[PDB]
Short mmCIF file of C-alpha atoms and ligand atoms in Angstrom, two decimals:
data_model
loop_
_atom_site.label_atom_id
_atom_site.label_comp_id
_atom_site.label_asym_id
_atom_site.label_seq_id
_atom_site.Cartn_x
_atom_site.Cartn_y
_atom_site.Cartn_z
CA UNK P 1 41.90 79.13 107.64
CA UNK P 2 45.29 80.79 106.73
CA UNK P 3 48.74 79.19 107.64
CA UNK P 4 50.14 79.78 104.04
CA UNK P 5 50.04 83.46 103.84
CA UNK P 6 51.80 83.85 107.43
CA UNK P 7 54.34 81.01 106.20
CA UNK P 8 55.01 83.25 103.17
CA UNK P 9 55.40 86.52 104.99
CA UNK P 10 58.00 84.55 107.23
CA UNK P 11 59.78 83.07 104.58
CA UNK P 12 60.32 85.78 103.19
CA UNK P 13 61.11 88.10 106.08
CA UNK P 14 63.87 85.23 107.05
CA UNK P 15 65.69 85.20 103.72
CA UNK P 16 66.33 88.42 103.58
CA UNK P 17 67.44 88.60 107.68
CA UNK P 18 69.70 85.25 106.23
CA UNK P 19 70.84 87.97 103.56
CA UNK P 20 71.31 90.94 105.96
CA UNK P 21 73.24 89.06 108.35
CA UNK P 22 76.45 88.89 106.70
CA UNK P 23 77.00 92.73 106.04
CA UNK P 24 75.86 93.46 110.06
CA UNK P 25 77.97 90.80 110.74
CA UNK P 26 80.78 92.81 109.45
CA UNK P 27 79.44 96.06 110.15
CA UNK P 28 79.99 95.06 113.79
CA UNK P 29 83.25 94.15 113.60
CA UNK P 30 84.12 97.30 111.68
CA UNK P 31 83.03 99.29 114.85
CA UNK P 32 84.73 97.54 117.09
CA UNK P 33 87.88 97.56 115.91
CA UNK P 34 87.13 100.87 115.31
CA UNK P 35 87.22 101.59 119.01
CA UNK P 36 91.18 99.55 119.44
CA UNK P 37 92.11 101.92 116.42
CA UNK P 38 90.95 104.78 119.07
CA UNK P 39 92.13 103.55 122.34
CA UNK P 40 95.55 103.20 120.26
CA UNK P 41 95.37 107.08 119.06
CA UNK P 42 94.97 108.48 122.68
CA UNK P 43 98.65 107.20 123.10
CA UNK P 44 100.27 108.86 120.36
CA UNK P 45 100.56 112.01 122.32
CA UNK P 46 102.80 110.73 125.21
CA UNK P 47 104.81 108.54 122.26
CA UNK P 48 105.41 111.94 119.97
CA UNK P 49 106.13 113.67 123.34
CA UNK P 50 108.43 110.78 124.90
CA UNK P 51 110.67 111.23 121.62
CA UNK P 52 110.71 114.78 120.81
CA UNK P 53 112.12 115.53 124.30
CA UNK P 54 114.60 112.66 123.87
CA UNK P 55 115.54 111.24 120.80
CA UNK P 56 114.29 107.80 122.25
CA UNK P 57 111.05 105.75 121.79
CA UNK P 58 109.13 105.04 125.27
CA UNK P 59 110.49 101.53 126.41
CA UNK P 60 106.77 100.42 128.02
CA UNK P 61 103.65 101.99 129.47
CA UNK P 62 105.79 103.30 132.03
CA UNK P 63 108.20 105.11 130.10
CA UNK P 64 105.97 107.01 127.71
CA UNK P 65 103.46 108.07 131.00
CA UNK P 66 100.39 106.48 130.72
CA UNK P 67 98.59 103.83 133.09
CA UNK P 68 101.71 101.24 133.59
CA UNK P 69 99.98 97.78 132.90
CA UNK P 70 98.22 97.52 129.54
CA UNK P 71 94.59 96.18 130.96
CA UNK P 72 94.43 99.67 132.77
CA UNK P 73 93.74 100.88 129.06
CA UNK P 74 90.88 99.03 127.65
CA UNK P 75 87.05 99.34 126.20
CA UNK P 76 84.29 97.51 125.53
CA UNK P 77 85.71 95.90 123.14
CA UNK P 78 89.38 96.18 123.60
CA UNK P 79 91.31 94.20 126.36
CA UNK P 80 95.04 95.86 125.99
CA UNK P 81 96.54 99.11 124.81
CA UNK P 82 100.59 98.06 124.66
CA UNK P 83 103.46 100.70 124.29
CA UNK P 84 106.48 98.31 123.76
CA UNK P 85 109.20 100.98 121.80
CA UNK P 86 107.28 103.34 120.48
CA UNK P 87 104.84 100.72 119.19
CA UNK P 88 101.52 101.15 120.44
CA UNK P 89 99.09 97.64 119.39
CA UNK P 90 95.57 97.29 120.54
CA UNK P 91 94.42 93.73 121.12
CA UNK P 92 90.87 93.17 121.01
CA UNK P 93 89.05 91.44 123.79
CA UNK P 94 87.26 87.94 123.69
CA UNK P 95 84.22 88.60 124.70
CA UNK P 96 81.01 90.59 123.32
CA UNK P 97 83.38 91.06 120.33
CA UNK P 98 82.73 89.15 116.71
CA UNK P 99 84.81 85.60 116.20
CA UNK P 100 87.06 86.72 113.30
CA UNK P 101 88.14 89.44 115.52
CA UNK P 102 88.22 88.52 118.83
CA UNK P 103 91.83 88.43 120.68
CA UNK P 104 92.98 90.05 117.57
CA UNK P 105 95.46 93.32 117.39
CA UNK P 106 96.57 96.40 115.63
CA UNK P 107 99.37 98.87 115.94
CA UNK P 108 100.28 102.29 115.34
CA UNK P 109 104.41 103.27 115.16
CA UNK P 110 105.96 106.60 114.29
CA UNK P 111 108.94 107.71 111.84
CA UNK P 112 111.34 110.71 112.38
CA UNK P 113 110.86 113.25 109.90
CA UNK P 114 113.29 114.94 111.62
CA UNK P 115 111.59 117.60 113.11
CA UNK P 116 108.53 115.72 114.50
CA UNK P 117 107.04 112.38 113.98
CA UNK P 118 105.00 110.88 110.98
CA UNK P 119 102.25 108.12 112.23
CA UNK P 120 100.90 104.75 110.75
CA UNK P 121 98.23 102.46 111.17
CA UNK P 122 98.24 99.12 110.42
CA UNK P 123 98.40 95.56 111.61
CA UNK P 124 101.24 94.83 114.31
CA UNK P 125 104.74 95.72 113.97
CA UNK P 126 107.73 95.34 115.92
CA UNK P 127 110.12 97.98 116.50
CA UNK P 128 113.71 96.46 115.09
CA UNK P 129 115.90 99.77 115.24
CA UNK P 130 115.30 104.12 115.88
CA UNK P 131 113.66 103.76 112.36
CA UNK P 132 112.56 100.67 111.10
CA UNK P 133 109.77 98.31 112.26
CA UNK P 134 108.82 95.00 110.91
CA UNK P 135 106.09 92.86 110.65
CA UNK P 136 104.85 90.88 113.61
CA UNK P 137 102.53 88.84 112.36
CA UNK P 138 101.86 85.74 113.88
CA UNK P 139 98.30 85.29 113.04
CA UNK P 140 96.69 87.40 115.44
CA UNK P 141 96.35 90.29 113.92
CA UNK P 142 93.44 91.84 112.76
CA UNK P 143 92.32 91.20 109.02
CA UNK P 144 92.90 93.30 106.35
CA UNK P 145 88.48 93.53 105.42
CA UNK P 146 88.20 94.97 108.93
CA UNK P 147 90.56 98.01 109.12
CA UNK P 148 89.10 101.36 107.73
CA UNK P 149 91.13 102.57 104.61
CA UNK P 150 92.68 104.97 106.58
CA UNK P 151 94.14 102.12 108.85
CA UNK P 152 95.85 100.10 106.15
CA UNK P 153 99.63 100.66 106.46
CA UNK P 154 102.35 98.32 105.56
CA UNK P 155 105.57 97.66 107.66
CA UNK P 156 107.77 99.30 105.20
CA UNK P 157 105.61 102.29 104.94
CA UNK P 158 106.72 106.00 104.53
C1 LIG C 201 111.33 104.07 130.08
O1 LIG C 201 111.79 104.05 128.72
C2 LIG C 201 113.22 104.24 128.66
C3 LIG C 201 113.61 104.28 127.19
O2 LIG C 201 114.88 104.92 127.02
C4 LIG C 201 113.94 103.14 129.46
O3 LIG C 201 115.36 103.31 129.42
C5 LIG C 201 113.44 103.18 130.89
O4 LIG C 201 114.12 102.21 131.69
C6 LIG C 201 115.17 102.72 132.47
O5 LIG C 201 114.69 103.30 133.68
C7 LIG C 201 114.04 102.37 134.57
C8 LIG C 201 113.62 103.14 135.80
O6 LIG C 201 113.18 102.28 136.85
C9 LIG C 201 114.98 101.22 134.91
O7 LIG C 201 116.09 101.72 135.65
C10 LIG C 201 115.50 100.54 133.66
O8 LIG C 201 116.46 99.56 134.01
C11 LIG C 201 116.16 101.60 132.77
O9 LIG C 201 116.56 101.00 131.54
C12 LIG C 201 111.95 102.91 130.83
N1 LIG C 201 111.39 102.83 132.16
C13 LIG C 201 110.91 101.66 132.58
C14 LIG C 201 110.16 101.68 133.91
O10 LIG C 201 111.19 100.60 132.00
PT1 PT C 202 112.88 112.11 130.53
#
């Protein structure tokens, strides 16, 4: 009468879950943030747009023409899309998203190369002058493990 065998299978089914559980874990959070880093891109338009025409990054929302409070812009996973100077930084919502991430944020910020605009990705920024952001970090923003290569830009970046 066989308890052992079944206790075996088991254990060793649940070691390996204990094993998997980690890289899902961050798998997860990979895709969601994935989704901020594309709520953020569907904003770059109006931005480029906003200071071709002008010579001026958008002030807010408002300014660069797209829905005027930040909520009005948000996923599944996302809470906030935020144009504040030409800036645009996603924050992540707290809710059905991962714990390291949740409440979290990126940003995406432009650079004349006079002509058009050049775009990064990164963790937030704040716009300082026409040209030069700087770092905002304040310990929400997203960590470095869960941005995409692509996504990896610092301040100072060119
Ligand atoms: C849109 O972005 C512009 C960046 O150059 C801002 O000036 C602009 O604000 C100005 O226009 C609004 C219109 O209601 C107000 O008069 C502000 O006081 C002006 O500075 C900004 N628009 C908004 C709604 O902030
Ligand atoms: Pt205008």
């Amino acid at each position: 009468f066989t308890l052992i065998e079944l206790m075996i299978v088991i254990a060793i089914v649940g070691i390996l879950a204990a094993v998997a559980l980690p890289a899902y874990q961050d798998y997860t959070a990979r895709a969601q943030v994935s989704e901020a880093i594309l709520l953020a891109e569907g904003q770059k338009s109006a931005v480029t747009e906003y200071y071709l025409n002008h010579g001026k990054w958008p002030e807010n929302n408002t300014s660069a023409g797209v829905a005027s409070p930040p909520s009005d812009i948000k996923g599944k996973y996302v809470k906030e899309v935020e144009v504040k100077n030409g800036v645009v930084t996603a924050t992540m919502l707290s809710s059905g998203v991962n714990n390291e991430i949740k409440g979290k944020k990126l940003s995406l910020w432009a650079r004349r190369e006079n002509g058009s605009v050049k775009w990064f990705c990164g963790q937030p920024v704040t716009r300082t002058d026409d040209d030069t952001v700087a770092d905002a970090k304040d310990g929400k923003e997203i960590d470095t493990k869960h941005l995409p290569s692509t996504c990896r830009d610092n301040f100072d970046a060119k």
